[PDB]
Amino acid sequence: MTVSDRELEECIRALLDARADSASICPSDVARAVAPDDWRPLMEPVREAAGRLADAGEVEVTQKGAVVDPRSARGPIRIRWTRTD
């Protein structure tokens, strides 16, 4: 409606790309970057985007230190670049 899947994906990459190795972001960091004035409605779209990038092996999503699916996980999660050797 207001943000494309592609836009959300590019924003996840852009925010992660700007951070240190092993750093992470949260879904609100993405939602605020695309829609600063009204980010809460982007929360589920941002989880879907993270899920797609996780499926592609580009990022991992974690909750309480454990790798999780952002589409299934309840409450606050972290998003990080995959760093598997």
Side-chain angles (χ1 to χ4, degrees):
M1 268 206 74
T2 59
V3 196
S4 67
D5 292 355
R6 188 157 80 180
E7 266 184 77
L8 292 175
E9 288 162 27
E10 156 63 2
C11 181
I12 291 161
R13 291 185 188 117
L15 295 172
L16 284 179
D17 196 86
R19 288 206 186 190
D21 295 356
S22 293
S24 72
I25 61 173
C26 57
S28 77
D29 287 335
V30 192
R32 280 184 184 278
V34 301
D37 289 18
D38 192 16
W39 57 263
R40 282 188 112 79
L42 293 180
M43 290 297 76
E44 299 303 296
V46 164
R47 294 186 161 240
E48 293 290 332
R52 290 186 306 270
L53 293 182
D55 291 343
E58 298 197 7
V59 306
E60 292 166 312
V61 172
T62 68
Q63 190 176 249
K64 302 175 189 182
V67 171
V68 297
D69 182 342
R71 289 152 300 197
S72 294
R74 168 191 304 275
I77 57 172
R78 300 307 298 181
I79 309 162
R80 71 201 193 180
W81 288 132
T82 304
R83 286 195 62 86
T84 325
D85 291 314

